[PDB]
Amino acid sequence: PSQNALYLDLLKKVLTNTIYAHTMIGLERLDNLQHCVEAVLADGVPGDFAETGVWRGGACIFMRAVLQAFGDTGRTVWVVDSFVSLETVRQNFARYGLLDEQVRFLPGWFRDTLPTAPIQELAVLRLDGDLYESTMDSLRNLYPKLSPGGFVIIDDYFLPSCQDAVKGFRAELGITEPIHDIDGTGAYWRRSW
Amino acid sequence: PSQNALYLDLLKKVLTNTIYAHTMIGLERLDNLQHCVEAVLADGVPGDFAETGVWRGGACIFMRAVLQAFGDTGRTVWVVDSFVSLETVRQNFARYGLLDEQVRFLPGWFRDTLPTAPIQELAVLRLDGDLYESTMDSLRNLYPKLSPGGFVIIDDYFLPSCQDAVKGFRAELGITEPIHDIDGTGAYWRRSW
Numbered sequence: 001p002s003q004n005a006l007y008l009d010l011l012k013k014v015l016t017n018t019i020y021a022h023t024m025i026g027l028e029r030l031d032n033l034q035h036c037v038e039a040v041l042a043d044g045v046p047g048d049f050a051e052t053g054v055w056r057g058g059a060c061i062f063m064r065a066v067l068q069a070f071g072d073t074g075r076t077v078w079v080v081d082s083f084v085s086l087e088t089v090r091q092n093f094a095r096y097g098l099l100d101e102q103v104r105f106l107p108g109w110f111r112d113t114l115p116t117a118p119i120q121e122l123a124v125l126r127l128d129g130d131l132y133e134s135t136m137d138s139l140r141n142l143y144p145k146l147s148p149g150g151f152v153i154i155d156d157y158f159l160p161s162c163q164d165a166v167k168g169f170r171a172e173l174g175i176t177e178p179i180h181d182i183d184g185t186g187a188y189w190r191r192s193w
Numbered sequence: 194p195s196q197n198a199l200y201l202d203l204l205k206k207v208l209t210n211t212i213y214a215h216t217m218i219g220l221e222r223l224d225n226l227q228h229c230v231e232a233v234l235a236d237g238v239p240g241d242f243a244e245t246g247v248w249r250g251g252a253c254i255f256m257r258a259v260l261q262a263f264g265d266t267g268r269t270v271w272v273v274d275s276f277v278s279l280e281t282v283r284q285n286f287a288r289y290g291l292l293d294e295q296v297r298f299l300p301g302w303f304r305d306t307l308p309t310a311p312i313q314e315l316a317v318l319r320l321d322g323d324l325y326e327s328t329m330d331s332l333r334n335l336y337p338k339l340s341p342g343g344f345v346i347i348d349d350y351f352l353p354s355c356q357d358a359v360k361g362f363r364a365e366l367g368i369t370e371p372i373h374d375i376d377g378t379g380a381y382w383r384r385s386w
């Protein structure tokens with residue numbers, strides 16, 4: 001059931017700066033990110049949230065905001081990137097009053113930070129898969145933490161080179177859950193039960 | 194009881210542009226405007242809302258937003274000024290998706306538009322009382338429509354010349370409901386029962 005719909009609808013107008021930028025990903029993809037997050041809450045899919053490649057942080061701020069909207073104080077949002085520096089993203093969470101303990105930051109190269117990542121389980125995994133290595137590093141390390149019922153979201157999936165990186169990973173692991181389109185740009189799938 | 198608090202809290206961060214301008218009046222005065230509007234809804238004080246001197250319209254957008262937040266479809270918000278033109282304010286309501294039938298516009302000089310004003314009753318009357326004539330025109334014409342339990346809000350009350358205009362009006366009508374401070378700038382009073 002849709003708690004604080006108005007809040008989240010306004011926040012998307014604001015994050016996308018449609019109101020006068022904090023995320024390039026646009027409305028349709030924030031919409032997708034809302035439904036996936038609301039599904040894991042409603043269905044009881046355990047785990048934290050995590051985005052690799054956050055840029056200014058809008059998507060991570062938004063995921064945090066949905067947790068705010070449904071009164072979930074247990075799940076953590078993981079903001080993972082090299083760093084548009086870290087402190088700028090931090091204070092981007094602040095301006096929404098969401099810079100708190102439900103937001104943790106993993107600064108550094110993915111090669112270095114992800115294998116030893118202090119994440120136990122995920123209900124949502126998100127990546128702006130522009131590059132081959134970034135995508136594999138993210139999927140290979142973090143996907144195994146993705147709980148059943150959890151979602152993987154790939155923001156630039158339909159870029160052919162991103163496609164191929166992704167098909168390659170799904171072949172490696174024998175992952176066969178079917179991919180669904182979002183907007184001709186991004187795509188996602190829900191891990192099986 | 195506080196419906197959609199998160200929505201309204203975010204909207205104030207946005208209207209005041211504390212998030213990256215739509216109202217100069219600031220947080221404390223949007224806060225005051227929230228409590229007064231929530232009181233008339235909770236207490237059943239009938240009537241529309243009306244602001245004279247709106248500038249970009251932020252306060253009027255906000256009043257409309259509180260109606261959005263409490264699911265009140267009956268009350269109208271009156272946006273009253275000469276016109277930073279009218280159409281700019283209109284599309285300022287649009288960017289929040291609140292440009293609808295619960296918002297009506299009274300363009301023109303107060304001398305011309307207010308005596309023949311198509312307003313029946315008010316629960317909230319608001320003015321940025323910078324000038325003597327604007328203040329009197331607003332109070333004299335519209336205050337008598339203010340229901341019992343209704344609020345009058347004067348955004349620049351503590352400016353000495355605004356003070357005196359206002360004391361003058363309250364003397365004229367034998368209005369004795371005591372004035373309360375907001376922030377050292379604005380002030381308001383609640384009409385008696």
Ligand SMILES: [Mg+2]
Pocket residue numbers: 128129130155156
């Ligand atoms: Mg992208």
Ligand SMILES: [Mg+2]
Pocket residue numbers: 321322323348349
């Ligand atoms: Mg003023």
